[PDB]
UniProtKB/Swiss-Prot annotation:
Belongs to the Diels-Alderase family. It comes from Pyrenochaetopsis sp. It is an enzyme of class 5 (isomerase). Pathway: Secondary metabolite biosynthesis. This is Diels-Alderase phm7. Changing residue 176 to A: Significantly decreases enzyme activity. Changing residue 243 to A: Significantly decreases enzyme activity. 3-aminomethyl-p-menthane which is similar to the phomasetin substructure, dose-dependently inhibits phm7 activity in vitro and production of phomasetin in the fungus. Changing residue 64 to A: Significantly decreases enzyme activity. Diels-Alderase; part of the gene cluster that mediates the biosynthesis of the trans-fused decalin-containing tetramic acid phomasetin, the stereochemical opposite of the HIV-1 integrase inhibitor equisetin. The PKS module of phm1 together with the enoylreductase phm4 catalyze the formation of the polyketide unit which is then conjugated to L-serine by the condensation domain of the phm1 NRPS module. Activity of the Dieckmann cyclase domain (RED) of phm1 results in release of the Dieckmann product intermediate. Residues 1-221 are annotated as: Beta-sandwich motif. Keywords: Isomerase. GO terms for molecular function: isomerase activity. Substrate binds at residues 49, 82, 343.
Length: 373
């Protein structure tokens, strides 16, 4: 029953080599339908991302579905699938799909399908009021199974949606949003070949935590960032989700952030600015400063972060201490060397809250650098 449909096929000419302007941001909408619906540019990107982890911080599973030109010569649109087991084994692949289809149905639901020539696919389906999302994985020889995210807040997702471009933006022209807010998650999946033995494993999460991201831009990442950190987390009653970028020379090294903080399902802080209508401060913790926390394998040696939410009418705000607890993925983003960069995914251990609070929880996070000056 689709009323809007966008279907792109790598094999056709759906990708143009000069810039394209997205359709305008829709206030108080999740903007789930593609903003580049008929064709994309070599610059443009769109993201639908669904991440999950268990309440004990021992299992994670995330899937990022992209429309962009990055995977064309590898045969299609890319999805990033990463999983971590309780014995520390991890599975991560970039999967390529020749066709990406997204539809909005008469009932208001949104469906997406990344589809391969061989019949494999990853599909998603999102409720009209954004309170549930489901993914189905059917990738022969790689991964099969299901994932589900569900929001149970007394306040609807719609009441928390950005009402203006500025509330939806990391910086001008870069949209990054969290339209589902706090979610409970489950995963049931089977992987064909896991670990150094290449043997089959199943992965289960139930009543877990996690989050959804919807983002898009005509601006390529290197033109506004050379370092980024993203986490979704649950810390006692708090649910938080943040992207913070550090600028490349092309934006005069300015930092940007989108962050949201919920208390038992109610929004208490929405920040689209860094400290320097709430604001966040995000400071790296170095291993000479704190004895707990892993570092990644590249030039960024931090062992975690301090995340502060500041309000103009709040004396002390909220502060959360983030420590890298378990490695998920690790991949280089430059040739190796003493300044070699990379990307590192984490299960985080996180504690804190307002003044006088010391809640404890976990997060699923990642950081990236790219060698743009």
């Amino acid at each position: 029953e689709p009323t809007s449909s966008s279907s792109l096929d790598i094999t056709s000419n759906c990708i143009i080599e000069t810039p394209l302007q997205p359709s305008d941001f829709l206030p108080k909408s999740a903007n789930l339908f593609p903003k580049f619906p008929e064709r994309i540019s070599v610059d443009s990107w769109e993201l639908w991302e669904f991440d999950t982890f268990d309440t004990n911080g021992s299992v994670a599973f995330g899937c990022s579905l992209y429309r962009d030109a990055r995977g064309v010569e590898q045969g299609g649109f890319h999805a990033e699938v990463n999983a971590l087991w309780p014995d520390g084994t991890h599975w991560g692949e970039t999967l390529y799909f020749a066709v990406s289809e997204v539809v909005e149905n008469s009932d208001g639901t949104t469906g997406g399908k990344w589809l391969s020539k061989d019949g494999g696919s990853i599909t998603f389906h999102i409720a009209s009021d954004y309170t549930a999302a489901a993914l189905d994985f059917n990738v022969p020889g790689k991964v099969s199974g299901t994932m589900e995210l569900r929001n149970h807040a007394n306040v609807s997702p719609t009441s928390n949606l950005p009402a203006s471009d500025a509330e939806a933006q990391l910086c001008p022209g870069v949209y990054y949003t969290f339209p589902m807010g706090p979610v409970a998650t489950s995963v049931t999946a089977t992987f064909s070949s896991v670990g150094a033995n290449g043997e089959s494993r199943e992965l289960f999460i139930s009543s877990g935590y996690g989050g959804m991201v919807r983002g898009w831009s005509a601006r390529p990442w290197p033109t506004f960032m050379n370092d980024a950190y993203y986490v979704v987390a649950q810390v006692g009653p708090y649910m938080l989700q943040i992207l913070r970028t550090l600028g490349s020379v092309f934006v005069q090294h300015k930092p940007f952030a989108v962050a949201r903080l919920y208390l038992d399902g109610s929004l208490v802080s929405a920040a689209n600015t860094v400290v320097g209508g709430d604001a966040v401060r995000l400071t790296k913790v170095q291993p000479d400063e704190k004895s707990q926390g892993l570092s990644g394998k590249f030039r960024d040696g931090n062992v975690g972060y301090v995340l502060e939410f500041a309000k103009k009418d709040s004396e002390h705000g909220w502060t959360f201490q983030i420590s890298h607890k378990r490695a998920v993925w690790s991949e280089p983003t430059s040739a190796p060397g003493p300044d070699g960069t990379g990307k590192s995914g984490w299960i985080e251990a996180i504690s804190g809250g307002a003044k006088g609070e010391n809640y404890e929880g976990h997060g699923f996070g990642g950081q990236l650098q790219i060698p743009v000056p």
